[PDB]
């Protein structure tokens, strides 16, 4: 629930996901949905991870991804843009960005 965190909801899990792929996923989301942010290239995402760190035998749904921004203002800008845009996509499939 940190001020600089958002949750990325609905990204399918993958057995071959790694840190590089997660960084690329966030950049793909920005480029697919938020062209002014993409052009400016000043989203300073600091850490990106699935939560929790393990996928349990009880879990039924893909884990959220927590994205921690360097700037709280930028977290909030992305959240506001997502909410106003409505449908936000990753390879044409809907995802959600929400507060942590």
Swiss-Prot record:
Chain ranges passing through the membrane: none
Entry annotated with the keyword Cell cycle: no
GO biological process, one term: retrotransposition
Gene Ontology cellular-component terms listed: cytoplasm; cytoplasmic ribonucleoprotein granule; cytoplasmic stress granule; nucleolus; ribonucleoprotein complex
Any one GO molecular-function label of the UniProt entry: nucleotide binding
Record region (RNA recognition motif (RRM) domain): 5-100
Localization per record: Nucleus, Nucleolus; Cytoplasm; Cytoplasm, Cytoplasmic ribonucleoprotein granule; Cytoplasm, Stress granule
Keywords: Coiled coil, Cytoplasm, Nucleotide-binding, Nucleus, Ubl conjugation
Keyword Transmembrane helix: no
Subunit comment: Homotrimer (via coiled coil domain). May also form larger homooligomers. May interact with DDX39A, HNRNPA1, SERBP1 and YBX1. Interacts with TEX19 and UBR2. Interacts with MOV10. Interacts with APOBEC3D; this interaction inhibits LINE-1 retrotransposition.
Function in brief: Nucleic acid-binding protein which is essential for retrotransposition of LINE-1 elements in the genome. Functions as a nucleic acid chaperone binding its own transcript and therefore preferentially mobilizing the transcript from which they are encoded.
Comment, domains: The coiled coil domain mediates homotrimerization.
Family: Belongs to the transposase 22 family.
General remark: Long interspersed element-1/LINE-1/L1 retrotransposons are present in more than 500'000 full (6 kb) or truncated copies in the human genome. Most of them are inactive but 80 to 100 of those elements could be transcribed, translated and active in any individual. An active LINE-1 encodes for 2 proteins translated from a single RNA containing 2 non-overlapping ORFs, ORF1 and ORF2. ORF1p is described in this entry as a representative of all ORF1p potentially expressed by active elements. ORF2p is described in the related entry AC O00370.
Protein name, entry field: LINE-1 retrotransposable element ORF1 protein
Species of provenance: Homo sapiens (Human)
């Amino acid at each position: 629930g940190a001020m600089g965190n958002l949750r990325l909801i609905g990204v399918p899990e993958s057995d071959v996901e790694n840190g590089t792929k997660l960084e690329n996923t966030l950049q793909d989301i920005i480029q697919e949905n938020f062209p002014n942010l993409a052009r400016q290239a000043n989203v300073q995402i600091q850490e990106i991870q699935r939560t929790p760190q393990r996928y349990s035998s009880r879990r039924a749904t893909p884990r959220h991804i927590i994205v921690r921004f360097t700037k709280v203002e930028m977290k909030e800008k992305m959240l506001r843009a997502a909410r106003e845009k409505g449908r936000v996509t990753l390879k044409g499939k809907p995802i959600r960005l929400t507060v942590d």
